[PDB]
Structures are given as structure tokens and as C-alpha cells.
């Protein structure tokens, strides 16, 4: 994922390795000159998933799915069902605990556990 | 009325159409990337999620998977807006007489005449989407999703969604008369009437020969076969004798298909007629691409406190294929004097703690997958091991020491073998970045739904919540022992 | 439309064709009709290539070295002609010289900062519409169309030229 | 400003009325037909060259017994008025005279044809005439002469075929002479100004010339059905330098997976010939790839890149930057 | 074609008051004021005189 240009040659060098003397020596195709490696890193990439190329609103795939709902709890101030639930951490805790957010409009309530 | 009552109605519509936007903005925080915002903790970037109003409208156009909860929220916040047609106007109004009696129209066909049209969403569009506050001043290139997507970006396909505050009496803007021509174009085609004509033609002769014999049971006109032994009549009068009870049952389904409400939902639900055809087409096995299962959560978890929510978050963590490419952030083939071409995978600590994993257990699921799959690589030889470290001493990245790394000593041999860069960069790197680390391999995604009247009841309370596993050999003979 | 999303309208034809007039049935979206203020273009007989070098545009080099140091490329009818200095004074000087009845009035010149280009189209096939300008509006049954076109108080804005200018809807209100 | 609101509110009513008098409701059917008969016929008869007739299919003997070769020459296109012959007398021909009589309203064309076999003013055909045009008889007439066979609610824009009146609908097509970016695959086409000079640069996988393992994204160009690599076409003319060939493709973007495709594109072109060896070494591959087709052009490959490659920019080194 | 002799709804004869309508429209009178001089109080017999095309002056040329 790297490329260098040859001095007074102007070609793309090749990352080969010497057998006896263990040193990364860069060699170009036509001039066949030698040059040491100042970085020792022949690959660098911020690799992502990249499984959907221009297929967001044209395909039914989902990168970030929605949060589920449950109707078995009753909120305190709103007194209504159909609240969401997930698992997260709060200010440092060994493990994850259950959370709740009231999905009813004009309620604005969220209680731990 | 004569004066100020129209002004009160206008000032109330303009405030009820600004609260139904903040209701829909609240529903878009139910995305799994926003799990750190809904916790009981102080945050610093909380002002960036409440000040950006154009960004939340731009996110509703593209990526149509959270736009199905931004339509149903407006359709639930508009019920308090449609109820303004009873406080305003007398009872002798000729529209409220024909709307309460159910003769022609309803309350939805009056608020568009008087107060506001509402929302406009179509099935699928391309390369243009309507913004919020659609006026003459909102016709600029970079700050509107009509001409340009954004500035930073794959946004070639859009699903438009806009709300109009002008009614059919005040007068429509030239842009509001263009949104109403984009959205209402789906109800103008006429190449769809053949679809309820070819369904009831193939559905006809499957029941057109079933009649009622004199023995008290139905028959078949070809070979005198028995379809069923007793007709399922609710009435206790045995007067249905001699008539073709299947020829009046095929037209009974034809009448529910010719008058089907063919106003399609955008992308999640297809059509009320296509959902009928997909149920009627039973043996038409078009393919095994996507098969969905059902996992009812009927167990001993109900005796404990919050047992169903704790039980439906372990199957979701054990039956969801999480690839290795969603954890890595930096790959680097580093020369090191075994083959001298080793590769690194820098793993962030927060992105690994959020998925409930550890650096000492991320190599075990990789070794247990590389051992059983030593027949699909290039050079299957000895000495293929994966190790773990805490600091990658190199010159590529020097951000911090809070990112663990796993060195992968690649396969070597003490004979004639290959160790080229084109072999290590094409078959080895996409194999480790596509191997599973959590869950199964053939499971695409799982969902947690909540239905009131589900199929296969308990037969001895309340409504249960179940998982919806979706697969990609057999179907249930491989989802069981996993 | 001899043939996807072709049956749905698009915000490109804002005043060119009708987004409300469409024959229902099998041709719903393919057969569209033009608006009232609609005229097609005609290929210009004169060569506009020699008239651009005297307006702040230099010829590009041909010795395959010394590349552009942040210089925009001018696209005359899809072909390269040279390189410009700045895409703010040059495009305005050409738009001010087109109104003086020297350049052909059926020219759709468009600048953009994203693609780093200057596009000038003189071919036949584009459809135009007349839009009145605000800068020359201070020049006040004595109004023929040629007198409005030659003095520059009225111009034919093309399809690409409508994307970099804000048009007020009300002529005397907004 | 100093201008009143009622003046600008009434200025649009005077501008649109002056627009509808000059251009009228038909400004697309007449302004594109007057350009066709005045300039389109002067190039469709001139951009075809000549004709060559030689039936000597055994041994060429042109100088022996003076074999005559047939050549032609075209030019001086002139359109006649619509006139029909009636009892050896030439009269006028109006559209209502052709509608009732079940005839086709048309006018004949004539060019000057000259032949030479040793070592005029013929007719070609008749095109239909659109009414109320530059050549039609219902032009620059008076109000008293037009009241004989013309209606007040009738205007031009329709042809008079013998059956009925036929009109033209605007056929919409793609834009020519513009870079066409496609998707799946990633082709960048280039439309033609001549008959066929298309240029399709494709970024796809290399199924050909592979060792069954290296199958990644490579740059291939489809020029006259040659499938030559793009990097060898870079060294075929102009730059002659690999490090000086990245400034023509300079975009200053993030190097994630596109530099690997450029490395694959130079390694494919290095695997079939030697690119940076000499000047006349990279041209040999395209000179043998032009001749390796079922319908080859003229074999002068040094001049074939001037009238078939980029009908435009004339300099050879300037074609590499495009 | 020509102005109808009777109104289509009321039945009042208006075929004769067409030349004296154009004779009063030649002056500086308004179309809403030229009908009050012909004794027309309802809007049924006024839409005939206000909105009517004179096609015979276009049909008499040939
Ligand atoms: Zn060298
Ligand atoms: Zn590392
Ligand atoms: Zn009357």
C-alpha cells in the first residue's frame, strides 16, 4: 500500500528482501538500484466493512439496526407501556445493566433497571 | 368564524407541526449507535444532537431503515392535530355531516382542505430529496439535498419525506405543488390491474370443481375425491347441498383482491396485494436466499425479575454473526526478522469493550476457525499461529498505548514454498477479516419483535416477545445444534 | 423518452417541462410537454474559441510537465481549450460580455468549485427560458424582445446556469 | 429601490406579451427546421467523400488497356420551390391544395454531379416540406392574400403526408461529448464526434492474463476493440516517465485501496512488454493490437491517433493529460 | 358564433343590445358600467354581454 519513486530513474520500486543480510532493500525495475527502508511498513489501510457500495436506500440491509421495544413495564410519571430496552455502561461498572427509555411522546422518562 | 378564529387555528397548526417534528426527532435516537446517549450520565456532545435540525432531516432521506419509525411517529403525533376539526367549526358544517356519517370521506379528507395536507412519502425515488422549511429561500446548492448530497459520501439513492404546512385553501407553493406531484405519481399508473386478473384466473380451477354432494360432504369433480369430510359451516342449517361452494369461495378471494388498497408502504412492507400473493403462492419455491425462523421465548425465565428482557439479550449476543472487520481499525504488514512478512491488527479498547469481548478471547475464536478451515488458503503448511500483545513497537501509528494488537505469524515451511506479497495480500488478509468471532456463520441478523396475537399460541396470560432469526444443508437441522 | 425513475419528475426541469401535465395509463412519465417559457437552442455558426483568449484565459502547455498550481480547466463544448486564472472574475466577465450582444445568447456557461472546472456549452439540443437580471434592472407598449435582449436587462438562463444563482419567485414582492 | 412596485408588477405582462409575439408558441419546430435545410444538407452531401468502382478481380491492368475508374463529385446543394406539373404549366402549390388532392407536399433537391472515367445538375429526391417555413409558400405574405386557403386558428409545424397531417415529437437521448460515469462496472465512456471513436476506460477485475490467484481491480481501456492496458497507453505517447505520470492523475485523496489497483495496473502492463525501455517499444504493442482485429483501419499507426483518438486537441503530448 | 337572442336561463331578449354595447364600449366606460346603462340588474343576463366571442368578424373574410 506504499510507493516510492526512483532517483534519476523515475519508476515504481519493488519491496524485496535480501537473503543473507537481513535488511529491507527497495529495488526499481529498470535501474536495479538499492535503497534501505526508513519506515519498514509496506501496508497501511483503515479497513472497514465496505459490503454495501451505494446500496443504502436501494437494498433492505441495515448497518445500524433499531432498538427493540417491550410492553411489559409501566413508566413512573407517564404510566404507559411500550418502552425500549438495551444494555450499556454508566460511569464504570463490571458488566452491562438493563436500561429503559419511555418511547411515549411528551413523556421524557428514562430509569435504570 | 369571522375574525381571529382562523388566526388562532393558523397559530395552532404552526405549533402542532413543530412539535410533531420534535416527536419524530426523538424516535431517531433509538439507533444502536446512540446507546451511550440514553444512559443516566452527563455528556459533552449532547448539544450537537439537539441543535442540528437540518442534519436529522437529511438523515431521514438516505439509509431507509430508520425512516419507517419516522413515518409512524408522525402518524401518531398527527392524531392530536386532526382532532382540531371538532373544536373549530359548527356542527351544521356540511363536511362534518358527511364525515361523521361515513358517507363520503373521513376526517383525513377535511384537515387537508382546511388546516394542512400533512406528510408526503413515496415508495422509492432517486437522486433528489425534499428538505425541511420548503420556501423560496431554501433553494441553495450545498445546504439542500435536492442538488448536492453533502460536503465532506455515497448518497445516490434517496427516499423523500416532507411535511407541508399550507392547506388546499390558502394556496400551494410551486415547490409544495411539486412535492404533491412527486408523491402522488404512484397512484396515476394503470399497468397494475392485470395483477388481480392473473391471480384469480389461476386460483379459479383449484376450487371451481369442488361441489357439495348428497352424502353431506364435499367432493372433487375429476376423480370423486374427498377434499374434506365436513364443510366448516358456522350455521347449523344443512341447506348448502348441490351448489359449487368452491366457485363462491374463489370469487370470495377475488373480491378481496380487486378492491385491495394498493397504496404501498415505502420499503419495509411491499403491498397488501403482494403479501396476499406471496401467501397464496405456496409451492412456488423461487429460491433459498433468505429464510426466516421464529424463536419463542417460552421458558422458566418468567419467575425471575425482568426475565424476558434478560433472555432476549443472550440469544441476540450468541446468534448474531459479528465479523472481524467491524472490530479492526488498522492493518499493517510489517517486516520483521518463520516468514518475515507478519501482519498486525490494532484493536481499540472501547470498540472491544462495547461488544462484550476481550483481547485474550479474540484469538481463541480465530484459532478455532483457522484450524477447521485449513483447506481454503494458498499454502496449507505447519506453523500457523496467532499471538497477542499489548503494544505494537513500530513506526506506523504512535497515537497511544490504549490499543491492543495481535501479531499474526503467517504460515511457513522449511522447503520450497511461497511467501510473496501478492499471496499474503489477496487470500490471507480477506480470510481473517471475514472470519466470525461471535455467533454462528450462516445467520444474517436477528430481531426482537412484539406481537399481540402471534401464530402457534401457548394453549395454557399476556402477549409474549420472540426472536426473529434470519438464515441465508438445511434450515432447521442446522440452527438447532449451534 | 424511448426506454426506472423516469416516470417520476425531477427538480432539474424547473420551468422547462410540466410536472403536472402527464397522460395517465402506459405512458405516465415518459411523454412530457414543454412549458410556456420554453425554447430550444441552436448550434452557433461562429467560433467562440478565439474570443475567450482576450478575456483572461491562457493557453495550456504541451510539454507534459509543470502541472497546474490550482488552476481551473475550462471545458469548451466538452473539449479542452486552456486554463483560467480565477473562476470568479473570468466567469463574471464572460457573463457580462454575453449580455452586450457579442457572445451568442444561447450559451450555457456554468462554474463549479466541487469538480474544479468551467463548463461552456454551445451545442444544439438544450432548452432555455428567460430570466430577468437584477444588476441591469436599473435601466427602466415600447418594449420589443430584441431591445430587452441586446441591452442585457433580460437573458436566457440555461439548464446548468440555474444551479449557481438564486431566483426570486415574486418579481415585485420577494 | 427607486422603482415602484406597480411598475415591476406590470413589466412582466409586457415582457411575456413581447415574448409571445417574437418567438410565438412554436419556436422549436421552425428554428430547428430552418437550420436543417440551410446547413444540414450542406454537410450530409459533403462528408461522404467519393465512390470507387473497379471490377478487376483477377489482375490489375489499369495502365494496359485503360481500365475506366468511376469517380463522382458532390456540391452546390439547392432546394427548389414546391411545384407540380399540370397540363404543361407550372402553378403554385399550397398546403390546402395538397390536403384535398391526396398528395404529399414536398420539394425536390438538386446537386452538381460530375463523373470522370478517363485517365450535371442531377436530382436526388424529394423531402417533405413543413408548412409555414422558410421555403414554404405561406411565408412573408399579406393579410389579403392569406385569406384564400388558410385558417386563422392554424399554424405551422406539421408535415403534409398524403394520408393525414403528421407531426414530430422531441425524442430525448443521452448527452454526447461528455464523460459518462457508469456503475457496475465503473466505466467512463466518451461519445463520438466522428462515426466511431469511443473511449471506454474500465476499472474491473483481470480475468484474463492471470495466474488464477491475482484477480483484483485493474485499469483496462476499450479503444477500437484492443483491450490494451492504460499504463502502456501512458508510455505509448507523451510522458515517457512513471514518476511523472502521477501528476496527471493527481487528486490528493486517501490511499486505502486505489493505490493497490494502480500497482496492479502497472504490474499488468509490465508483464506483457517493457514499458519504459525505449520510445519505439511501447508503440509496437498498440501497432500490433490495432492490426489484430476483424476490421482494421489504415495501418499508419503514427497518424491513426490523430483522426481516431481524441478528435480534438491536436498535439500528441497534450492528449495524455485528458 | 353570433350573440344569442335570448338568455340561456332567464329568457330576457338580448339579441338587439349588442351594437349599442360595442357603441358604448368604444368610449372610456368600464365593462361593469356599460351594462348598467342597458338596464340589466341580474348577473344571469350580464355574463352573456360580458363574455361572448365575436366569431363572425373572423368568419366573414372568406
Ligand atoms: Zn532506477
Ligand atoms: Zn500492531
Ligand atoms: Zn339572464
CSV table of C-alpha atoms in Angstrom, one decimal, chain C residues 1-2 31 34 36-40 42-43 45 59-67 77-81 83 105 119 121 123 130 132 137-138 140-146 148-149 153-154 156 160 171-173, chain D residues 3-9 11-12 14-16 18-20 22-25 27-29 31-32 35 39 169-173 175-179 190 238-239 244 247-248 311-313 315 317-318 320-322:
chain,number,residue,atom,x,y,z
C,1,UNK,CA,-38.5,9.0,-23.6
C,2,UNK,CA,-37.5,5.9,-25.5
C,31,UNK,CA,-44.4,11.7,-22.6
C,34,UNK,CA,-42.9,21.7,-22.5
C,36,UNK,CA,-44.9,28.3,-21.9
C,37,UNK,CA,-41.5,29.9,-21.5
C,38,UNK,CA,-39.6,27.2,-23.4
C,39,UNK,CA,-37.3,27.4,-26.4
C,40,UNK,CA,-34.7,25.0,-27.7
C,42,UNK,CA,-29.4,26.2,-32.0
C,43,UNK,CA,-25.8,25.5,-32.8
C,45,UNK,CA,-22.2,29.3,-36.6
C,59,UNK,CA,-3.4,28.5,-23.4
C,60,UNK,CA,-2.3,25.4,-21.6
C,61,UNK,CA,1.2,24.0,-22.0
C,62,UNK,CA,2.0,21.0,-24.2
C,63,UNK,CA,5.5,19.9,-22.9
C,64,UNK,CA,3.9,17.3,-20.5
C,65,UNK,CA,5.5,18.9,-17.4
C,66,UNK,CA,4.9,21.8,-14.9
C,67,UNK,CA,1.3,21.0,-13.9
C,77,UNK,CA,-18.2,22.2,-25.5
C,78,UNK,CA,-16.6,19.1,-23.9
C,79,UNK,CA,-13.1,19.8,-25.3
C,80,UNK,CA,-10.2,21.4,-23.6
C,81,UNK,CA,-9.1,24.9,-24.7
C,83,UNK,CA,-6.5,27.2,-18.3
C,105,UNK,CA,-27.0,34.4,-26.3
C,119,UNK,CA,-18.2,24.4,-18.5
C,121,UNK,CA,-21.8,24.7,-23.9
C,123,UNK,CA,-24.2,22.9,-29.0
C,130,UNK,CA,-35.9,33.8,-20.0
C,132,UNK,CA,-34.6,38.9,-15.8
C,137,UNK,CA,-32.7,46.3,-13.7
C,138,UNK,CA,-32.0,50.0,-13.0
C,140,UNK,CA,-36.0,51.3,-16.5
C,141,UNK,CA,-46.1,49.2,-25.4
C,142,UNK,CA,-42.5,50.3,-26.1
C,143,UNK,CA,-40.7,47.0,-25.2
C,144,UNK,CA,-39.7,44.7,-28.0
C,145,UNK,CA,-37.8,41.5,-27.2
C,146,UNK,CA,-34.7,42.3,-29.1
C,148,UNK,CA,-34.6,43.7,-24.0
C,149,UNK,CA,-32.1,41.1,-25.1
C,153,UNK,CA,-31.9,43.5,-18.9
C,154,UNK,CA,-33.1,40.0,-19.9
C,156,UNK,CA,-31.7,33.2,-21.4
C,160,UNK,CA,-26.7,24.3,-15.9
C,171,UNK,CA,-40.9,39.7,-9.3
C,172,UNK,CA,-42.1,42.7,-7.3
C,173,UNK,CA,-42.8,41.1,-3.9
D,3,UNK,CA,-38.6,51.7,-8.9
D,4,UNK,CA,-42.2,51.4,-8.0
D,5,UNK,CA,-43.9,48.1,-7.2
D,6,UNK,CA,-46.8,48.6,-9.7
D,7,UNK,CA,-44.2,49.2,-12.5
D,8,UNK,CA,-42.4,45.9,-11.9
D,9,UNK,CA,-45.8,44.1,-11.4
D,11,UNK,CA,-43.4,44.8,-16.6
D,12,UNK,CA,-43.8,41.0,-16.7
D,14,UNK,CA,-45.3,43.5,-21.2
D,15,UNK,CA,-42.3,41.2,-21.3
D,16,UNK,CA,-44.3,38.0,-21.8
D,18,UNK,CA,-43.4,40.7,-26.4
D,19,UNK,CA,-42.0,37.2,-26.0
D,20,UNK,CA,-45.1,35.5,-27.4
D,22,UNK,CA,-41.5,37.2,-31.5
D,23,UNK,CA,-40.9,33.6,-30.7
D,24,UNK,CA,-44.5,32.5,-30.6
D,25,UNK,CA,-45.9,29.2,-29.3
D,27,UNK,CA,-40.1,28.3,-31.5
D,28,UNK,CA,-38.7,24.7,-31.6
D,29,UNK,CA,-40.2,23.1,-34.7
D,31,UNK,CA,-36.0,27.3,-35.7
D,32,UNK,CA,-34.6,23.7,-35.9
D,35,UNK,CA,-31.3,25.3,-39.7
D,39,UNK,CA,-26.8,24.0,-43.1
D,169,UNK,CA,-42.2,14.6,-31.1
D,170,UNK,CA,-39.0,15.6,-29.4
D,171,UNK,CA,-37.0,12.4,-28.9
D,172,UNK,CA,-34.8,12.7,-25.8
D,173,UNK,CA,-31.5,10.9,-25.8
D,175,UNK,CA,-25.6,13.7,-23.8
D,176,UNK,CA,-22.8,13.3,-26.3
D,177,UNK,CA,-19.1,14.6,-25.9
D,178,UNK,CA,-19.2,14.2,-22.1
D,179,UNK,CA,-17.7,11.8,-19.6
D,190,UNK,CA,-16.6,9.0,-24.3
D,238,UNK,CA,3.8,12.0,-24.2
D,239,UNK,CA,5.1,11.4,-20.7
D,244,UNK,CA,5.9,12.0,-13.9
D,247,UNK,CA,0.7,14.3,-11.6
D,248,UNK,CA,-1.8,13.8,-14.5
D,311,UNK,CA,-11.0,14.3,-32.4
D,312,UNK,CA,-10.0,17.5,-30.7
D,313,UNK,CA,-6.7,18.6,-29.1
D,315,UNK,CA,-0.8,18.0,-30.0
D,317,UNK,CA,1.8,15.2,-25.8
D,318,UNK,CA,-1.3,17.2,-24.9
D,320,UNK,CA,-2.0,12.4,-22.3
D,321,UNK,CA,-3.4,15.0,-19.8
D,322,UNK,CA,-7.0,14.4,-21.0
